[PDB]
Amino acid sequence: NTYYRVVLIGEQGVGKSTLANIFAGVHDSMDSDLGEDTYERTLMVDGESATIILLDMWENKGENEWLHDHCMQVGDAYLIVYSITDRASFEKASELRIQLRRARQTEDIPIILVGNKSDLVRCREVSVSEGRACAVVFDCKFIETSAAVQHNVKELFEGIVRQVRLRRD
Numbered sequence: 001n002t003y004y005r006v007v008l009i010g011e012q013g014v015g016k017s018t019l020a021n022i023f024a025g026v027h028d029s030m031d032s033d034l035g036e037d038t039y040e041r042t043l044m045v046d047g048e049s050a051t052i053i054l055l056d057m058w059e060n061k062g063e064n065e066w067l068h069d070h071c072m073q074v075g076d077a078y079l080i081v082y083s084i085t086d087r088a089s090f091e092k093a094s095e096l097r098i099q100l101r102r103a104r105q106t107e108d109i110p111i112i113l114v115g116n117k118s119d120l121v122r123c124r125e126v127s128v129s130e131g132r133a134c135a136v137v138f139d140c141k142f143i144e145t146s147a148a149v150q151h152n153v154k155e156l157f158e159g160i161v162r163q164v165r166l167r168r169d
């Protein structure tokens with residue numbers, strides 16, 4: 001089907017739920033078109049409609065299943081989120097990315113490293129240029145977002161759709 005399934009991973013506190021909720025928006029209850037930690041919404045990209053399923057399950061079992069079961073949730077793209085104001089979370093993200101590489105199934109799947117909370121300039125602990133450096137060295141795409149100020153949130157999800165489309169030929 002024409003669904004774009006995006007899996008959100010990263011340390012607790014980095015803003016995965018906020019970013020999902022901010023991209024999802026508040027939905028019109030009359031829309032007939034999905035339970036635990038799941039966001040679904042259509043979005044027009046480059047002229048063609050895309051149905052994005054966002055899976056935010058890492059805190060409820062996703063992380064433990066990675067550790068104990070050695071299994072990652074199936075997606076068309078993975079979003080590895082850290083907070084620009086938290087260096088430990090950034091190192092987790094890099095660790096997660098390296099570990100994901102070893103799921104050889106994910107070879108031709110878009111992985112995006114996301115530095116969230118770019119609105120917190122004064123608390124910044126990770127530079128833009130080292131987020132980028134990590135992306136280049138560990139073979140990701142890279143973006144900085146703010147879910148609070150809603151910066152690069154649409155651009156993130158349009159970019160995921162274009163990458164996923166580039167794959168399917």
Ligand SMILES: Nc1nc2c(ncn2[C@@H]2O[C@H](COP(=O)(O)OP(=O)(O)O)[C@@H](O)[C@H]2O)c(=O)[nH]1
Binds near residue numbers: 014
């Ligand atoms: N200032 C700021 N705070 C954020 C942003 N995104 C999330 N947060 C806050 O970070 C805290 C944890 O965010 P949450 O969405 O629960 O992170 P999660 O554990 O990764 O799902 C909350 O207090 C959020 O309000 C952001 O872009 N800017």
